[PDB]
Design a binder for this molecule. Structure first.
Ligand SMILES: [K+]
Ligand SMILES: [Mg+2]
Ligand SMILES: [Mg+2]
Ligand SMILES: [Mg+2]
Ligand SMILES: [Mg+2]
Ligand SMILES: [Mg+2]
Ligand SMILES: [Mg+2]
Ligand SMILES: [Mg+2]
Ligand SMILES: [Mg+2]
Ligand SMILES: [Mg+2]
Ligand SMILES: [Mg+2]
Ligand SMILES: [Mg+2]
Ligand SMILES: [Mg+2]
Ligand SMILES: [Mg+2]
Ligand SMILES: [Mg+2]
Ligand SMILES: [Mg+2]
Ligand SMILES: [Mg+2]
Ligand SMILES: [Mg+2]
Ligand SMILES: [Mg+2]
Ligand SMILES: [Mg+2]
Ligand SMILES: [Mg+2]
Ligand SMILES: [Mg+2]
Ligand SMILES: [Mg+2]
Ligand SMILES: [Mg+2]
Ligand SMILES: [Mg+2]
Ligand SMILES: [Mg+2]
Ligand SMILES: [Mg+2]
Ligand SMILES: [Mg+2]
Ligand SMILES: [Mg+2]
Ligand SMILES: [Mg+2]
Ligand SMILES: [Mg+2]
Ligand SMILES: [Mg+2]
Ligand SMILES: [Mg+2]
Ligand SMILES: [Mg+2]
Ligand SMILES: [Mg+2]
Ligand SMILES: [Mg+2]
Ligand SMILES: [Mg+2]
Ligand SMILES: [Mg+2]
Ligand SMILES: [Mg+2]
Ligand SMILES: [Mg+2]
Ligand SMILES: [Mg+2]
Ligand SMILES: [Mg+2]
Ligand SMILES: [Mg+2]
Ligand SMILES: [Mg+2]
Ligand SMILES: [Mg+2]
Ligand SMILES: [Mg+2]
Ligand SMILES: [Mg+2]
Ligand SMILES: [Mg+2]
Ligand SMILES: [Mg+2]
Ligand SMILES: [Mg+2]
Ligand SMILES: [Mg+2]
Ligand SMILES: [Mg+2]
Ligand SMILES: [Mg+2]
Ligand SMILES: [Mg+2]
Ligand SMILES: [Mg+2]
Ligand SMILES: [Mg+2]
Ligand SMILES: [Mg+2]
Ligand SMILES: [Mg+2]
Ligand SMILES: [Mg+2]
Ligand SMILES: [Mg+2]
Ligand SMILES: [Mg+2]
Ligand SMILES: [Mg+2]
Ligand SMILES: [Mg+2]
Ligand SMILES: [Mg+2]
Ligand SMILES: [Mg+2]
Ligand SMILES: [Mg+2]
Ligand SMILES: [Mg+2]
Ligand SMILES: [Mg+2]
Ligand SMILES: [Mg+2]
Ligand SMILES: [Mg+2]
Ligand SMILES: [Mg+2]
Ligand SMILES: [Mg+2]
Ligand SMILES: [Mg+2]
Ligand SMILES: [Mg+2]
Ligand SMILES: [Mg+2]
Ligand SMILES: [Mg+2]
Ligand SMILES: [Mg+2]
Ligand SMILES: [Mg+2]
Ligand SMILES: [Mg+2]
Ligand SMILES: [Mg+2]
Ligand SMILES: [Mg+2]
Ligand SMILES: [Mg+2]
Ligand SMILES: [Mg+2]
Ligand SMILES: [Mg+2]
Ligand SMILES: [Mg+2]
Ligand SMILES: [Mg+2]
Ligand SMILES: [Mg+2]
Ligand SMILES: [Mg+2]
Ligand SMILES: [Mg+2]
Ligand SMILES: [Mg+2]
Ligand SMILES: [Mg+2]
Ligand SMILES: [Mg+2]
Ligand SMILES: [Mg+2]
Ligand SMILES: [Mg+2]
Ligand SMILES: [Mg+2]
Ligand SMILES: [Mg+2]
Ligand SMILES: [Mg+2]
Ligand SMILES: [Mg+2]
Ligand SMILES: [Mg+2]
Ligand SMILES: [Mg+2]
Ligand SMILES: [Mg+2]
Ligand SMILES: [Mg+2]
Ligand SMILES: [Mg+2]
Ligand SMILES: [Mg+2]
Ligand SMILES: [Mg+2]
Ligand SMILES: [Mg+2]
Ligand SMILES: [Mg+2]
Ligand SMILES: [Mg+2]
Ligand SMILES: [Mg+2]
Ligand SMILES: [Mg+2]
Ligand SMILES: [Mg+2]
Ligand SMILES: [Mg+2]
Ligand SMILES: [Mg+2]
Ligand SMILES: [Mg+2]
Ligand SMILES: [Mg+2]
Ligand SMILES: [Mg+2]
Ligand SMILES: [Mg+2]
Ligand SMILES: [Mg+2]
Ligand SMILES: [Mg+2]
Ligand SMILES: [Mg+2]
Ligand SMILES: [Mg+2]
Ligand SMILES: [Mg+2]
Ligand SMILES: [Mg+2]
Ligand SMILES: [Mg+2]
Ligand SMILES: [Mg+2]
Ligand SMILES: [Mg+2]
Ligand SMILES: [Mg+2]
Ligand SMILES: [Mg+2]
Ligand SMILES: [Mg+2]
Ligand SMILES: [Mg+2]
Ligand SMILES: [Mg+2]
Ligand SMILES: [Mg+2]
Ligand SMILES: [Mg+2]
Ligand SMILES: [Mg+2]
Ligand SMILES: [Mg+2]
Ligand SMILES: [Mg+2]
Ligand SMILES: [Mg+2]
Ligand SMILES: [Mg+2]
Ligand SMILES: [Mg+2]
Ligand SMILES: [Mg+2]
Ligand SMILES: [Mg+2]
Ligand SMILES: [Mg+2]
Ligand SMILES: [Mg+2]
Ligand SMILES: [Mg+2]
Ligand SMILES: [Mg+2]
Ligand SMILES: [Mg+2]
Ligand SMILES: [Mg+2]
Ligand SMILES: [Mg+2]
Ligand SMILES: [Mg+2]
Ligand SMILES: [Mg+2]
Ligand SMILES: [Mg+2]
Ligand SMILES: [Mg+2]
Ligand SMILES: [Mg+2]
Ligand SMILES: [Mg+2]
Ligand SMILES: [Mg+2]
Ligand SMILES: [Mg+2]
Ligand SMILES: [Mg+2]
Ligand SMILES: [Mg+2]
Ligand SMILES: [Mg+2]
Ligand SMILES: [Mg+2]
Ligand SMILES: [Mg+2]
Ligand SMILES: [Mg+2]
Ligand SMILES: [Mg+2]
Ligand SMILES: [Mg+2]
Ligand SMILES: [Mg+2]
Ligand SMILES: [Mg+2]
Ligand SMILES: [Mg+2]
Ligand SMILES: [Mg+2]
Ligand SMILES: [Mg+2]
Ligand SMILES: [Mg+2]
Ligand SMILES: [Mg+2]
Ligand SMILES: [Mg+2]
Ligand SMILES: [Mg+2]
Ligand SMILES: [Mg+2]
Ligand SMILES: [Mg+2]
Ligand SMILES: [Mg+2]
Ligand SMILES: [Mg+2]
Ligand SMILES: [Mg+2]
Ligand SMILES: [Mg+2]
Ligand SMILES: [Mg+2]
Ligand SMILES: [Mg+2]
Ligand SMILES: [Mg+2]
Ligand SMILES: [Mg+2]
Ligand SMILES: [Mg+2]
Ligand SMILES: [Mg+2]
Ligand SMILES: [Mg+2]
Ligand SMILES: [Mg+2]
Ligand SMILES: [Mg+2]
Ligand SMILES: [Mg+2]
Ligand SMILES: [Mg+2]
Ligand SMILES: [Mg+2]
Ligand SMILES: [Mg+2]
Ligand SMILES: [Mg+2]
Ligand SMILES: [Mg+2]
Ligand SMILES: [Mg+2]
Ligand SMILES: [Mg+2]
Ligand SMILES: [Mg+2]
Ligand SMILES: [Mg+2]
Ligand SMILES: [Mg+2]
Ligand SMILES: [Mg+2]
Ligand SMILES: [Mg+2]
Ligand SMILES: [Mg+2]
Ligand SMILES: [Mg+2]
Ligand SMILES: [Mg+2]
Ligand SMILES: [Mg+2]
Ligand SMILES: [Mg+2]
Ligand SMILES: [Mg+2]
Ligand SMILES: [Mg+2]
Ligand SMILES: [Mg+2]
Ligand SMILES: [Mg+2]
Ligand SMILES: [Mg+2]
Ligand SMILES: [Mg+2]
Ligand SMILES: [Mg+2]
Ligand SMILES: [Mg+2]
Ligand SMILES: [Mg+2]
Ligand SMILES: [Mg+2]
Ligand SMILES: [Mg+2]
Ligand SMILES: [Mg+2]
Ligand SMILES: [Mg+2]
Ligand SMILES: [Mg+2]
Ligand SMILES: [Mg+2]
Ligand SMILES: [Mg+2]
Ligand SMILES: [Mg+2]
Ligand SMILES: [Mg+2]
Ligand SMILES: [Mg+2]
Ligand SMILES: [Mg+2]
Ligand SMILES: [Mg+2]
Ligand SMILES: [Mg+2]
Ligand SMILES: [Mg+2]
Ligand SMILES: [Mg+2]
Ligand SMILES: [Mg+2]
Ligand SMILES: [Mg+2]
Ligand SMILES: [Mg+2]
Ligand SMILES: [Mg+2]
Ligand SMILES: [Mg+2]
Ligand SMILES: [Mg+2]
Ligand SMILES: [Mg+2]
Ligand SMILES: [Mg+2]
Ligand SMILES: [Mg+2]
Ligand SMILES: [Mg+2]
Ligand SMILES: [Mg+2]
Ligand SMILES: [Mg+2]
Ligand SMILES: [Mg+2]
Ligand SMILES: [Mg+2]
Ligand SMILES: [Mg+2]
Ligand SMILES: [Mg+2]
Ligand SMILES: [Mg+2]
Ligand SMILES: [Mg+2]
Ligand SMILES: [Mg+2]
Ligand SMILES: [Mg+2]
Ligand SMILES: [Mg+2]
Ligand SMILES: [Mg+2]
Ligand SMILES: [Mg+2]
Ligand SMILES: [Mg+2]
Ligand SMILES: [Mg+2]
Ligand SMILES: [Mg+2]
Ligand SMILES: [Mg+2]
Ligand SMILES: [Mg+2]
Ligand SMILES: [Mg+2]
Ligand SMILES: [Mg+2]
Ligand SMILES: [Mg+2]
Ligand SMILES: [Mg+2]
Ligand SMILES: [Mg+2]
Ligand SMILES: [Mg+2]
Ligand SMILES: [Mg+2]
Ligand SMILES: [Mg+2]
Lengths: 48, 275
RNA sequence: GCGGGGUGGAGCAGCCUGGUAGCUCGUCGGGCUCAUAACCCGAAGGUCGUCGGUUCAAAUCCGGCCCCCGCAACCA
RNA sequence: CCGAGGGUAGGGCCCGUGACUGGGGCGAAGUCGUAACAAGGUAGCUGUACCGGAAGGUGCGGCUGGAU
RNA sequence: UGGGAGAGGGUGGUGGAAUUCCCGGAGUAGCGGUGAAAUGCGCAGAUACCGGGAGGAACGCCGAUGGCGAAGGCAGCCAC
RNA sequence: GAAUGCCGGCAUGAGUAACGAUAAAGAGGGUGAGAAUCCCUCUCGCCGUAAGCCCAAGGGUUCCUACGCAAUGGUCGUCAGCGUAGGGUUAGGCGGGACCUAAGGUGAAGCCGAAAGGCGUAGCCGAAGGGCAGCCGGUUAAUAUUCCGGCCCUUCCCGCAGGUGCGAUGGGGGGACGCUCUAGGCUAGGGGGACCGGAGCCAUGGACGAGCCCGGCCAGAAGCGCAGGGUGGGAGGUAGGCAAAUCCGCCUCCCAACAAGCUCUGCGUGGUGGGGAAGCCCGGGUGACAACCCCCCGAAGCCAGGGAGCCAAGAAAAGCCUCUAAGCACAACCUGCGGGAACCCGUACCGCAAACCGACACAGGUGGGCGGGUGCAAGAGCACUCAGGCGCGCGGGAGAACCCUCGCCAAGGAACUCUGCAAGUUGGCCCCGUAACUUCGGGAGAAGGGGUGCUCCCUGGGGUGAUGAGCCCCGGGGAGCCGCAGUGAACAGGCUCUGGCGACUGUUUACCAAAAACACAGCUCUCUGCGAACUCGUAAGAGGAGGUAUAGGGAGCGACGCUUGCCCGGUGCCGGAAGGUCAAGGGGAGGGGUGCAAGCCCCGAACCGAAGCCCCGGUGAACGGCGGCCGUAACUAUAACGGUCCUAAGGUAGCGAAAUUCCUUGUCGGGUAAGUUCCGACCUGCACGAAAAGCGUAACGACCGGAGCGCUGUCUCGGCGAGGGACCCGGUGAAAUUGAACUGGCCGUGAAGAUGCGGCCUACCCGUGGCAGGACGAAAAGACCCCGUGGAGCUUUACUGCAGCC
RNA sequence: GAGCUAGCCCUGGCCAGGGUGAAGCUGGGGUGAGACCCAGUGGAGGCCCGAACCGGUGGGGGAUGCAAACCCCUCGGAUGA
RNA sequence: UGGUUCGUGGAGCCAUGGGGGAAUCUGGGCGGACCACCGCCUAAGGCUAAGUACUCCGGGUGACCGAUAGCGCACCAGUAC
């Protein structure tokens, strides 16, 4: 049947993207946390 | 003069539609319409604040002139009478001798090709607009300003009207469509006559589909829900209310008065509504 | 299993707060009426379901026994 | 080919009968009240409506076939 | 062709009397109702009196033993 | 040494289940160390509104070529979407950006919030919507509307010519719009041709034929032709379109009008450029100087912003046109022509799937376009088949039980069973015919029945064309032929009678309930006078609504018909300027502490003092409630009538053993041979009853009852047959489970149901196909029950707070 | 976190073919004029049959599955809420 | 109402959301209600090293671990998945 992951590059970039994070107090702490932990990528990969 | 249908479907049994007799023009004036922004009953938070709204036919808003003292002394001709999906009343197109075009809501009996005018010296004749103080006591009247220059607020729905009962200082006494007696300032404008399309209330929607066309989504009863949802929710099998009848939010809904007690307009309301 | 009842012929007070049995109807005698009823004047009839106890004294307070309605009998 | 009639299916009229049910006629001495005939003790009758154990009552309008 | 009487009918308008209700005034111990009462209304100011307002219905006197209509029926006043 | 412990390793089950759609394979020839599995050829089967082709999304090199086979591939592998390497994606016109706006988002002004932040006009962002200039063929191993060829077009810059009051982010026009139905003429697409072109063919009994087989076009600027869309002209006045205006709007006048003209688009033609089959021979060459014509069918597409009707009344902004303002009129703009200039990103391949979403090369999910032919009434249905694409990545045998899916069956025909569950039957079209009841529509495909192929002859009407031939579309009559059978295969209702519930079409527990539940038009009560009530928010602000009592919120009831009785004592709500109570505050009789004293300091009575509560009323489609005992009639029985107690008042109409009746299979009647169900009645209704509505109701229902006809493998009662498995052989090879095991019956015993203890009995060692009685077999630390001063949802006249409101 | 799912908002798209035959209009009849009746035209509808598409009624299978909801037969809606 | 040891307590002190509202030393605050006396201090402006805390970083040292330990990572780890 129809499953739950239905990929959409616009949807992905606008929801989890770099600029979405920086706009919001909680988004910025995510970046701050993911940097502190040393994540190789702060933000989901999407080809745009 | 409501129109009937033959019982050739279950819904056509009882369904009635307006006759649209008075209508003389069937697509609106392009310079007087702008898009209506459908809300779905949702506010700027995204939240539903009025339940069961949405999904009706698309509409264009027609800009209505509710301040006719805009153009005192300038007469106009009644060019056409049109359907308006945003109100129960019909509307009339006016061609002013000015060259300006405007909509008013159409009063009962108003015939296309007649003149109408607004001002203190205007003839007491259907379609004309005067400050209340210049209208003779006993006159039925509609589209009434509640305060001077603030716009017509009263008696706008199909078939409605207010009647002048007397005068008292700067104020006149009105009997509103509801039956209430109220003082309204004399400088407030009002159009003489009653609003037309009085057969409007005799229309029988006939099926659930017509409610949907009008943007009215299905209304689910409190008794049909669960306790997390409503005072009337729950019960094994059917249940009577088992408490004073309430709204979803807990307040009582048979008789509880809700007008604010210390409201300043109380000084102007003489007698609360009939019936 | 828990609850309330049993008192002139009928239907109900009095029982809680021990000593005092009361109300309407009915019944019996008289009256009015041609006569009956209605109506008026008089009167009689209960030892309080029963046995046992407390008491100076029990319809009454406490225990059985007989009876009468009433409520309950759920989870599998 | 037609054809007595037999068969399948569906209709129409009549008669008889049916748990139970509706009122009706009748029947020497049952129970309830007293509506009508006297102004019958609320004049009566009436079409209709609503109500009531029952006769009946009341409303609206009508008739005199109503007394004084 | 010329005349007349009439609550004949339909429509729109409109006049005063009375009842009820509402606001103001003035005023006090009862009002109402019946065969007699009681229910009811009244010191939270009723009834009775005066001024104001709202609303519906029916048209006193003329009026008659009268008039009109086919019958049912038709009565303030005005116009069509 | 144990913790259903943690991590890792290796066992058992076991050479067992399985190897992923039952569309299907066989042979020959190649390659190679090795071949059912790779390549080629022939034969066979499967899809063909796809299982073919083209987009979009998502994926991200998977594309092409060479060289490879350890792992990946459910077997094999020489092959591959796999390993290694090299190559491959070309645009002014296609799509997006340098254009526009939608919801929404953001947000100079402004507003609000302890902080963080929340709002918000203009503006800006935002697309699969608007706008905007490229069609046909050729070429590569792999890209092509991109490269090439032919023929066309757009914008920008500069220049020349002619013309004009030029000029705007401002004014105006336009853009610009729904649903259903639909005209004319076209194009896409298709059928046929005795005409035109073509390699060839004559078989096996006949045919050298008006034979068979193949093909018979595509694009195109100006001009022209056919068909459409759009659009009146001039003048005078003018106060409106937030400055101006010659524009637009309004008034008058003349002329035009189902036209014409002007303009725009589609189609046809069109200079020119292309393409071009079978068959043979080796993707190519030939065929070929290929021919390229006539008739018919014909769109849902085009002309288009067409026409009609209806109510639920159907985006914006830019491009574009017109008007003018500053300004400037050496300018500037419009038109024609010429030269120059024209950027960034995508483009491979997969794409109903082995490359996307499902952990898998997974029978599942995935939006748009094309989707041929014949026949069946039509069609995207069904059967076969074209182009194209496949046989589904384990095979070979055997011919057991049993399972699955399928076919038939003597006589009977629901006797099966909770239930005709299931499976039969019926089945399309044309004609005949069709009941109760009904809201007059319906019920209705009621029911039931007749017809249906092929051949010859006669004839009626329509479309195209020409009025005729031809082709195509509807028919009518007569005579015959064959079979068991003519919708001859495939697709395609079983019907009737009678109850309950719900009016109806709809909606729901994604994944055990589709229903009588929810919704629904309709009825009623109630709140709300507008800065509405109500809702979300601390607020600002929003919704309500750019609505205004014929409106908006809340509540119950639920089409329609006939109806909806009595109780206001309690609770709720509503009205009540009195009275009672009443907090902070006011008031200060009267005290008190301290000081030498002025004083400073504390307590404090009467009395004035809101809402709320008390108190007086009203109110039921507000919450709710609507009795008991005893007696009585000239047979009996039963009580129309009476007595008395109690209540706020004692259940009315209608209905009733019911979706409600305990006793109960009540009792009587119906149906049956027989009826705990069903239907009709009766009424001592354990425990119906009137908007948590009462009693009915035509139509409707994948709802739940009961009966009958039809027909059947449901059954008596089973039999045979088919394929896929199971079985055997070759290849690959799991799982839960498992204290260890050398693991029998009876009768006893034992913590009370023993392979394991006692006594007896029985038993050579080891497997394979089968069956399920036991191993208190497996799975899941019972979901029932209880216990825990364990948790959570929910309720209220439990307690205590808080929002909100007064 | 609303790329699943529920509702709303904006903007696009889709629904083979066949059946039934409302109003209106026209003509005829009728009447003082009407109502109304008949025929033709017309093409309405939470109308009817049935694909696509949306569902999920009954049964069978599947149950360490092809599948953590699938498959086969049958069945509901299909111009509308 | 908060702070303090102070939970309304005999409740001062410090701070302050609301109302009332002075004085300039003969002014004003405090010494735990309040009063007297006796003392302490000078509010409603502001700045100020050091001694104190921490360890991303560097070094030194362990009756610290020694690849299931020691950081999650001794190794291309905040990676693969
Ligand atoms: K239980
Ligand atoms: Mg699905
Ligand atoms: Mg889903
Ligand atoms: Mg999605
Ligand atoms: Mg996207
Ligand atoms: Mg996208
Ligand atoms: Mg998106
Ligand atoms: Mg976002
Ligand atoms: Mg972003
Ligand atoms: Mg922050
Ligand atoms: Mg890195
Ligand atoms: Mg992130
Ligand atoms: Mg109708
Ligand atoms: Mg009708
Ligand atoms: Mg109208
Ligand atoms: Mg506009
Ligand atoms: Mg709006
Ligand atoms: Mg709005
Ligand atoms: Mg907003
Ligand atoms: Mg938001
Ligand atoms: Mg709401
Ligand atoms: Mg809503
Ligand atoms: Mg409205
Ligand atoms: Mg209107
Ligand atoms: Mg006013
Ligand atoms: Mg209405
Ligand atoms: Mg609407
Ligand atoms: Mg509604
Ligand atoms: Mg509802
Ligand atoms: Mg409920
Ligand atoms: Mg529920
Ligand atoms: Mg919730
Ligand atoms: Mg709650
Ligand atoms: Mg609640
Ligand atoms: Mg409840
Ligand atoms: Mg319930
Ligand atoms: Mg119940
Ligand atoms: Mg209750
Ligand atoms: Mg309540
Ligand atoms: Mg409130
Ligand atoms: Mg009022
Ligand atoms: Mg008594
Ligand atoms: Mg007593
Ligand atoms: Mg006595
Ligand atoms: Mg006597
Ligand atoms: Mg004694
Ligand atoms: Mg004794
Ligand atoms: Mg005694
Ligand atoms: Mg229980
Ligand atoms: Mg039990
Ligand atoms: Mg049990
Ligand atoms: Mg015979
Ligand atoms: Mg007798
Ligand atoms: Mg009488
Ligand atoms: Mg009498
Ligand atoms: Mg009498
Ligand atoms: Mg009498
Ligand atoms: Mg009476
Ligand atoms: Mg006269
Ligand atoms: Mg008094
Ligand atoms: Mg007084
Ligand atoms: Mg009135
Ligand atoms: Mg141990
Ligand atoms: Mg453990
Ligand atoms: Mg472990
Ligand atoms: Mg290891
Ligand atoms: Mg492990
Ligand atoms: Mg291992
Ligand atoms: Mg082993
Ligand atoms: Mg093994
Ligand atoms: Mg085994
Ligand atoms: Mg297996
Ligand atoms: Mg398998
Ligand atoms: Mg299959
Ligand atoms: Mg097949
Ligand atoms: Mg072969
Ligand atoms: Mg082979
Ligand atoms: Mg091989
Ligand atoms: Mg091999
Ligand atoms: Mg091959
Ligand atoms: Mg085909
Ligand atoms: Mg390999
Ligand atoms: Mg090898
Ligand atoms: Mg290999
Ligand atoms: Mg290798
Ligand atoms: Mg492998
Ligand atoms: Mg595999
Ligand atoms: Mg090799
Ligand atoms: Mg390539
Ligand atoms: Mg190009
Ligand atoms: Mg490019
Ligand atoms: Mg540029
Ligand atoms: Mg954006
Ligand atoms: Mg943009
Ligand atoms: Mg776009
Ligand atoms: Mg373009
Ligand atoms: Mg072109
Ligand atoms: Mg080509
Ligand atoms: Mg412009
Ligand atoms: Mg438009
Ligand atoms: Mg528009
Ligand atoms: Mg549009
Ligand atoms: Mg429509
Ligand atoms: Mg063409
Ligand atoms: Mg086509
Ligand atoms: Mg064809
Ligand atoms: Mg052809
Ligand atoms: Mg051409
Ligand atoms: Mg002007
Ligand atoms: Mg000019
Ligand atoms: Mg050649
Ligand atoms: Mg289409
Ligand atoms: Mg075309
Ligand atoms: Mg078009
Ligand atoms: Mg806009
Ligand atoms: Mg100038
Ligand atoms: Mg110059
Ligand atoms: Mg020009
Ligand atoms: Mg650039
Ligand atoms: Mg490409
Ligand atoms: Mg598919
Ligand atoms: Mg597709
Ligand atoms: Mg593939
Ligand atoms: Mg893959
Ligand atoms: Mg496969
Ligand atoms: Mg698949
Ligand atoms: Mg073809
Ligand atoms: Mg067919
Ligand atoms: Mg195969
Ligand atoms: Mg095999
Ligand atoms: Mg075998
Ligand atoms: Mg078998
Ligand atoms: Mg099969
Ligand atoms: Mg079979
Ligand atoms: Mg056979
Ligand atoms: Mg048989
Ligand atoms: Mg049979
Ligand atoms: Mg038979
Ligand atoms: Mg049976
Ligand atoms: Mg059996
Ligand atoms: Mg069953
Ligand atoms: Mg069959
Ligand atoms: Mg069939
Ligand atoms: Mg019948
Ligand atoms: Mg019939
Ligand atoms: Mg019936
Ligand atoms: Mg009928
Ligand atoms: Mg038929
Ligand atoms: Mg025939
Ligand atoms: Mg034949
Ligand atoms: Mg069928
Ligand atoms: Mg029958
Ligand atoms: Mg029937
Ligand atoms: Mg239903
Ligand atoms: Mg239902
Ligand atoms: Mg019902
Ligand atoms: Mg009904
Ligand atoms: Mg209903
Ligand atoms: Mg439907
Ligand atoms: Mg449904
Ligand atoms: Mg479910
Ligand atoms: Mg569930
Ligand atoms: Mg579930
Ligand atoms: Mg199920
Ligand atoms: Mg259910
Ligand atoms: Mg259903
Ligand atoms: Mg539901
Ligand atoms: Mg409902
Ligand atoms: Mg319904
Ligand atoms: Mg109703
Ligand atoms: Mg109403
Ligand atoms: Mg709130
Ligand atoms: Mg608004
Ligand atoms: Mg009826
Ligand atoms: Mg009450
Ligand atoms: Mg009361
Ligand atoms: Mg009350
Ligand atoms: Mg002293
Ligand atoms: Mg008070
Ligand atoms: Mg009660
Ligand atoms: Mg009644
Ligand atoms: Mg019964
Ligand atoms: Mg029975
Ligand atoms: Mg019943
Ligand atoms: Mg019951
Ligand atoms: Mg029973
Ligand atoms: Mg029973
Ligand atoms: Mg029986
Ligand atoms: Mg009997
Ligand atoms: Mg019987
Ligand atoms: Mg009985
Ligand atoms: Mg109720
Ligand atoms: Mg109930
Ligand atoms: Mg029915
Ligand atoms: Mg029914
Ligand atoms: Mg249904
Ligand atoms: Mg159903
Ligand atoms: Mg049955
Ligand atoms: Mg049966
Ligand atoms: Mg069998
Ligand atoms: Mg069989
Ligand atoms: Mg077999
Ligand atoms: Mg092997
Ligand atoms: Mg292997
Ligand atoms: Mg062992
Ligand atoms: Mg052993
Ligand atoms: Mg053994
Ligand atoms: Mg053994
Ligand atoms: Mg034992
Ligand atoms: Mg044993
Ligand atoms: Mg043994
Ligand atoms: Mg042992
Ligand atoms: Mg031993
Ligand atoms: Mg032993
Ligand atoms: Mg032994
Ligand atoms: Mg033995
Ligand atoms: Mg074996
Ligand atoms: Mg075995
Ligand atoms: Mg076993
Ligand atoms: Mg077993
Ligand atoms: Mg066992
Ligand atoms: Mg065990
Ligand atoms: Mg067992
Ligand atoms: Mg389990
Ligand atoms: Mg546990
Ligand atoms: Mg446990
Ligand atoms: Mg458990
Ligand atoms: Mg459970
Ligand atoms: Mg237990
Ligand atoms: Mg406790
Ligand atoms: Mg405890
Ligand atoms: Mg607890
Ligand atoms: Mg989505
Ligand atoms: Mg459709
Ligand atoms: Mg038909
Ligand atoms: Mg017709
Ligand atoms: Mg028409
Ligand atoms: Mg339909
Ligand atoms: Mg049909
Ligand atoms: Mg299913
Ligand atoms: Mg079945
Ligand atoms: Mg199967
Ligand atoms: Mg399952
Ligand atoms: Mg399936
Ligand atoms: Mg099927
Ligand atoms: Mg079906
Ligand atoms: Mg259908
Ligand atoms: Mg359809
Ligand atoms: Mg503290
Ligand atoms: Mg303190
Ligand atoms: Mg302060
Ligand atoms: Mg001092
Ligand atoms: Mg001082
Ligand atoms: Mg201080
Ligand atoms: Mg101090
Ligand atoms: Mg000090
Ligand atoms: Mg100082
Ligand atoms: Mg200092
Ligand atoms: Mg320091
Ligand atoms: Mg290690
Ligand atoms: Mg480690
Ligand atoms: Mg270690
Ligand atoms: Mg570190
Ligand atoms: Mg580690
Ligand atoms: Mg590194
Ligand atoms: Mg790594």
């Amino acid at each position: 049947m129809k499953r739950t992951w239905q990929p959409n590059r616009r949807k992905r970039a606008k929801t989890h993207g770099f600029r979405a994070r920086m706009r919001t107090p909680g988004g910025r702490k995510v970046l701050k946390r993911r940097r502190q932990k040393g994540r190789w990528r702060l933000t989901p990969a999407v080809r745009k | 003069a409501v129109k009937k249908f033959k019982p050739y479907t279950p819904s056509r049994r009882f369904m009635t539609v307006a006759d649209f007799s008075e209508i003389t023009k069937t697509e609106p004036e392009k310079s007087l319409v702008k898009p209506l922004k459908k809300t779905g009953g949702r506010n700027n938070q995204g939240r539903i604040t009025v339940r069961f709204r949405g999904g009706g036919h698309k509409r264009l808003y027609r800009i209505i002139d509710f301040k006719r003292w805009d153009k005192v002394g300038i007469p106009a001709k009644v060019a056409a009478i049109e359907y308006d999906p945003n109100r129960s009343a019909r509307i009339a197109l006016l061609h002013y001798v000015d060259g300006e075009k405007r909509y008013i809501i159409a009063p009962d009996g108003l015939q296309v090709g007649q003149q109408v005018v607004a001002g203190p010296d205007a003839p007491i004749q259907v379609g004309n607009a005067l400050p209340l103080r210049f209208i003779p006591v006993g006159t039925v009247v509609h589209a009434v300003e509640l305060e001077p220059k603030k716009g017509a607020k009263l008696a706008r729905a199909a078939g409605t009207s207010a009647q002048i009962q007397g005068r008292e200082g700067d104020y006149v006494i009105l009997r509103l469509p509801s039956g209430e007696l109220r003082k309204v300032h004399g400088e407030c404008y009002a159009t003489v006559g009653a609003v037309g399309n009085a057969d409007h209330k005799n229309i029988v929607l006939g099926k659930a589909g017509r409610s949907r066309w009008l943007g009215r989504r299905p209304h689910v009863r409190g008794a049909a829900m669960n306790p997390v949802d409503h005072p009337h929710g729950g019960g094994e099998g059917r249940a009577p209310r088992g408490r004073p009848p309430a709204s979803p939010w807990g307040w009582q809904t048979k008789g509880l008065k809700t007008r604010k007690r210390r409201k300043p307009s109380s000084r102007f309301i003489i007698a609360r509504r009939k019936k």
